[model samples]
Target: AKLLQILNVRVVGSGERVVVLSHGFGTDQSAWSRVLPYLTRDHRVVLYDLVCAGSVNPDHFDFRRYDNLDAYVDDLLAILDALRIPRCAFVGHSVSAMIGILASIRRPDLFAKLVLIGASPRFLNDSDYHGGFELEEIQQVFDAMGANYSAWATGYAPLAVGADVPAAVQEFSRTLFNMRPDISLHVCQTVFKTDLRGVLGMVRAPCVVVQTTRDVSVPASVAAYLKAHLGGRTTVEFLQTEGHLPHLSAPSLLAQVLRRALARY
Candidate 1:
């Protein structure tokens, strides 16, 4: 019970088929609230806060352990073991998507399928890889965050959530502000720096990559890269949304995409 509290784990519904929803940086499990009603009717769903997120107990977070994406994968595996979940479909957004991929590679038997929403293997543009941002551009982002975290969050919120949805931008800003400055910076650095391109072929479970249209964080080409590199059966579905947080800004459409993806597995 105490351990579950540490991770802020929550389970909903009672269906035999299970689905775990994992949120990305800044936000907690509540990011899935808008789509829960659509999912819970047929599948048991699990949600939890990442250790470094503000909603989680700060003591539970170890900066050293979370310096890379692997630590989050470890926490994910621990949560699954603790709950005695044999197998389930994983729905992950942004960084959590790659975290799920790593977890599935480690224990393929534990995962039935994966739904990777707005996922990217790398963020910095390599010579041949189009990761969307240059190293210096990313460095500038870090510098802005360091200069004025609140101002950075306010400016970035609309960019991340899209200008079309004022409410989502506000919600995203609230969660981003809720996080501790240092921790938020650490998470941002960890997410943007870590690259998982080499391991995409190691994935064994079937995956559906939910590519959101017009996302500044993840480009359309990344989805093609993921599909080409993934070893197991993979499909890419383009979600006609404007920004990174499609589940928040376009919940109904995202839910429909999820349902269609889940129907295959």
Candidate 2:
């Protein structure tokens, strides 16, 4: 379908069960390559690039339409509808994780299960909740990106990727550079500005929250908040490692954990 092509959607493996894998901020579908072998051995894996993804055609991303996160839910539903995939396990990282949650809330029939990595309901801290960032800090993040996108990525990739994994940092940075600078900033604004706490109770699919020991993007407190609020029976799985992007830094371990988690629902 036209939508599939535009989103760079790909269906791989031949197993009967379906699993959709989506990437996070500053990454593309190829980010899942390392985890593919482990998943494909037992399940069909579906992968796609988000509209703001570095790999997607920049023209497809509508700034006004994507100003909020709801457009992403629409795009995700369209992608599944094009494939006629009504029931599938949904896996998303960072921004896409929220997208999956919103989508599952909108169309309860689509996601039989959800696996979210480094997900957050909100990034800015309010009086009762600690979302890990101050409003001024988030403002500086936008200012840094706008002032010099490349410099910001260079400085940010290492912190986000964590550890001394040079390869992973380089890979993440490369993808960040691939995006149109303005679009990347727009996506940052869209993601950091969203607060899905109010709607978490509407989610129906059971969820598996994949978290890390130390993820700069999401705090352990937020994970706890998600488990407490999401309408589904939510369980948090600690990756026993650092970094928001586990699939990249520790592919085999992430795959093993994913297999075990996916086995549950």
Candidate 3:
């Protein structure tokens, strides 16, 4: 009871097929609102806030517990257990997408399929791997946060949401500001510094990689990397959207993509 309460878990829809939607950093489960109606028609949807975001009780959050991505995976598994769900389709955005990958690897029984939206295994580029940003570039992101958190959110929201959707940019900025500055920075460092390249092949569940055309956070090359390395039956679908937050910027299109992916199973 306490665990569910602390996580603010919400379950909707009556379909037998369960679908868990996990949001990324800087946002909560509410991020899925735009796409929820479309999905609920065929799925029993599960939504929960990451410990640091939304209305979750702050006392339940421990910086040490969330020092790495593993803790978030643990929380995801815990939600499944609390709901008594044996297996479900998992849809995760941004950092949560990697979190789902790690969880699916750790407990394959809890997931039937995985849909990764704007997911990146690594943010900093390696010698040959185009993980997107360079080390100094990502550090500048952190530096911006340190200089003025609000200003960083304002600047980042537009870039992340793309120019197509002014409303989504505003919504994202609001959610970004709602987060406590300290927790926000901590999560930022943890997410950006993570390198999950080696573990990508360990994922055993069927996977779908949803890639947007013009996302600043994830490039086309990174999506290709995910498709090449994911150790399972994988399909890559390119959405014509132009941002990291597809559910916000292109909800209908995202829903269509999701339907096509889910139909395969």
Provide the lowest-lDDT 10-residue window in model 3: 52-61
Cα deviation of 62 in candidate 1 (Å)? 1.2
RMSD in Å for model 2: 0.9
In model 3, the Cα lDDT at residue 88 comes to: 92
Which candidate has the highest lDDT of all?
A: 2
Stretches of candidate 3 exceeding 4 Å from the true structure: none
How far is 29's C-alpha from truth in model 1 (Å)? 0.7
What is the Cα-based TM-score of model 3? 0.97
Candidate 1 pairs with clashing backbones? none
- Between candidates 2 and 3, name the one with more favorable TM-score: 2
lDDT of 1 by residue, 76-156 (tens): 888888999999999999889989999999999998899998799999899899999988998999998889999999888
Q: Pairs clashing in candidate 2?
A: none
Error of 3 at 6 (Å): 1.2
Candidate RMSDs in order: 1.1, 0.9, 1.2
Give the alpha-carbon lDDT of every model.
Answer: 0.88, 0.90, 0.88
lDDT of 2 by residue, 1-265 (tens): 7989999999998676899998999999989999999888788889999999878889888899999989988988998898988689999999999999999998998898999998999999998999999989989999999999889989999999887799999899889899999999999898888999999999999998988889998888999999999999899888778898998898887887789877756
